[PDB]
Symmetry: D2
Subunit: 292 residues, 4 copies
């Protein structure tokens, strides 16, 4: 279930920055039709930072309702306060999600023992499988493999989205966890390499605009057909790069609009509409992938 | 008013993580007695991350009440959502605070134009002076001198707490702003250097445990007595270093406890109590400064 | 020929810093007996910096003589002046070496076009296969995959020792070169990962003290036995780490002494004898690998 | 003598990469006429890496002959082998130079104790004042303030060219050395800040094309006229930046040609002629400074 191409889904908004149900329906039908394994709802790519807990809950429950059992949903439940993370966790108990994606606390920079106490306390308040999420570029906190090893001993801590692009982390973590602990890439440009080294999938920004290609690449990689997977990776590499020409998710929301998947690429401040330079880059990348 | 030694005040807590009014009274009395210019209430050092908006308001209001006009109070009002920053800003308008300290959005990594629109929107919803706060190690976002320069043209944006320790930024910023724009260090180990280059004070962690020494150093630096100011700096340099032996504010909360200023050095998860290694380092630094 | 475990051989010295022929004989006999694919003579690990061109020539020629056709020898020929690199290259033409290992110019930081002209000029003054060597931590110069791709089109430039530990570079380079172009790890702690991604061996420091284990790991990796190769990698990981506890080759020269392979671990200034802290770390790593 | 604007002089070359005496005469007459305090001959800016010891000696002795006692000369004597550094040091004993500029060993990355033994051994073989030179971006080795402190106890180790642009090093070093130890900037963009913090001059790339302005800025800074010095610094800041648009000394040699100070901007491989983009940047910077 937590293998293959998992999309970190955009939260589509109207002109006013309010969630657009018509666009969210189009996105979810697209993922159902194009082999996406699961949807991560309100991760970083889904603008977790600018949605209230109430709006956050509403987006996850709308995603579940529109999925209609056709595709599993994972709830973004990260917070930099343990109390707040437990609150989000309890909100999604018996919601219908299959698990939670929970980021390392950002801004306050806990110690590794702080990370252990944070995720242990969260895991205690749910039966839902927990996927840890390390992205030190954004958080200022790097959860080291030793800490991942310690947390992997807790029953419902089942995996990690490793977003560093540091490919030595795959076997550094595998050495300290059981064989069924799930390793997922959170870095699109190194996802293929990550899976070649033994990772079992990607939680992907690229999947938003290249669902079929990402699903195919992950299937081929998991089957050990690395040459065939890499030919797809090379078609997608301009997207893997240029979807971060401006901070995620500014480029990918314009990408979704360019493909007619969303009505508008509106984001909530402080995130801003894509620049002309950014738009030109994403256009070229989409064309290279044969999608425009 | 925004000059000299400004303390980034700890939020003292009991064993259960509730704010300790008895300890907060002792802290405020200590700053009034020892020459501190102003108090920043609920900044990074004040555990802004793990307080609710409601608890955040209560700590600022309790700080104003106990200060009783004896020392000015600046509200921490930072948020990574523009709507949330505006709501925090409105909560403190007409409260009695003299200004706001507002950090660059963390985790979501806006563009420089995003930072411009963020702080512009905040400045438009207040009468209060706004001090920008740049700490990319924690936020993943570096507000560049060019952007500070653009924001300095907005009426209510009056200065910046520059915490990078990049001392080139003093004159890179001064070159782009009026002589009236306030430059304050947010990096204790380079605060003396920052003032010698033309900065007009420090928003200080070290001031929590060495208020008199920091007030004297800033006074002598502003008076051009660099030799005398630097002799105090050398007495404090072990504190400037070792108060970050673990992530701020883990060490400084233990330091306040060791000096009898707070009853407990309890923090809120995910922040954790100081390690034995940390305790020994802070003990040695306090003794070096002649404070234990 | 340029596959498997290739040792970056130490230049053994007596107490006066003169090359020890008795120790060099023991080292070469050890590599022949323990499956090493080839010897790099006077690379970084061989103290290229502190040997004269004349002493450099003598060490390579003595290595060829003692090898006596039993194991191929690659000459270190790197220099930060193109004229000097050509002169070194000419010194080893018709010597009996099978190829040259030529580092990116250090200290003077040429452009990518400068690197192109440097290695093009060297390649034009030789019949010998050339292995590029990229180690920006030491040189201040990072040869990018694009530049490797341009150089790979020159007849005598046959591969690269990529020492960054950036595992993304395996397929970034492979994408721009023929299947014949040789990719070798120059980073011992990521060498196993590098081979699993499609690298065909390692130019190794660890091979100096664990020749049999490194030969077995590279053989199993090239055969696709990743699980068995990784079990050897885990036995060696303390060596892969602790052989850089002080700058290479300070630790590995002590390691060779501890195993009886050299009489003294003397280096030439400015390189210094291992510290007690370093000696203890290398002792513990050798014992972990079952070699003491 | 080792105060004010010291030029790190370019080594002017004809089309063949041979030293041009006519151009070297023009350069030295220019520095004599425009207030330059001293000439550093065959530093990094003088292409130390691509000149043989013989050619190196010839450039320093030609610089002395053309100076004709009108301006002091400091010899570049750095090498990454202690033996080689002693050889260069002995070459300039009783040459007529007033001192030596000696860089931290590059590429081989000695320990701090290695740096101490290197510079101690060099200082023993001369009566000439030695100026240490820290530029870790180029060398891969960072000489820390504690090491500078230890070396400052040796009689003829008299100062340091600190090229990091880390302005906290000024008082970190001053705290550990006597008041007469000489601190010079090796980073043009932070030279003014460095002198404001107590540095006594610059060993400058910018001085090659803006000798009069750099001499004036250093005189005003040393006299405590910081506002007047900074107005000159702002006129020069495009040069301080764009003279590193490509690695030094590629831009500054074109700059010297553009001002008619040298016949050609030829460099020795692997250094390359300035790109069109580079030329446009240096042109704009020279115009901003009012020099074209
Ligand atoms: Cl909800
Ligand atoms: Cl990251
Ligand atoms: Cl990597
Ligand atoms: Cl690929
Ligand atoms: Cl910072
Ligand atoms: Cl100081
Ligand atoms: Cl490297
Ligand atoms: Cl492994
Ligand atoms: Cl000479
Ligand atoms: Cl540097
Ligand atoms: Cl700095
Ligand atoms: Cl300035």
């Amino acid at each position: 279930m937590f293998t293959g191409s998992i999309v970190a889904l955009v939260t589509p908004m109207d002109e006013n920055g309010n969630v657009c149900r018509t666009s969210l329906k189009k996105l979810i039908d697209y993922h159902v039709a194009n082999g996406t394994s699961a949807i991560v709802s309100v991760g970083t790519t889904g603008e977790s930072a600018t949605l209230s807990h109430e709006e956050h809950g509403d987006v996850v429950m709308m995603t579940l309702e529109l999925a209609d059992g056709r595709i599993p949903v994972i709830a973004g439940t990260g917070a930099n306060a343990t109390a707040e993370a437990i609150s989000l966790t309890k909100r999604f108990n018996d919601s219908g999600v299959v698990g939670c994606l929970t980021v390392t606390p950002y801004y306050n920079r806990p110690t590794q023992e702080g990370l252990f106490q944070h995720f242990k306390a969260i895991a205690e308040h749910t039966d839902l499988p927990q996927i840890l999420y390390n992205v030190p570029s954004r958080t200022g906190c790097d959860m080291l493999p030793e800490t991942v090893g310690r947390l992997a001993e807790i029953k419902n801590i089942v995996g990690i989205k490793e977003a560093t692009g540091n490919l030595s982390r795959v076997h550094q973590i595998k050495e300290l966890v059981s064989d069924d602990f799930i390793l997922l890439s959170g870095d699109d440009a190194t996802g293929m390499d990550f899976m070649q080294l033994g990772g079992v999938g990607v939680i992907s920004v690229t999947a938003n605009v290249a669902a079929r290609e990402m699903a195919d690449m992950c299937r081929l990689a998991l089957a050990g057909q690395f040459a065939e997977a890499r030919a797809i990776n090379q078609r997608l590499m301009p997207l893997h790069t240029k979807l971060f020409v401006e901070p995620n998710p500014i480029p990918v929301k314009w990408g979704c609009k360019a493909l007619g998947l969303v009505a508008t690429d509106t984001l909530r401040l402080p995130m801003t509409p894509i620049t002309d330079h950014g738009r030109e880059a994403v256009t070229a990348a989409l064309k290279h992938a044969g999608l425009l």
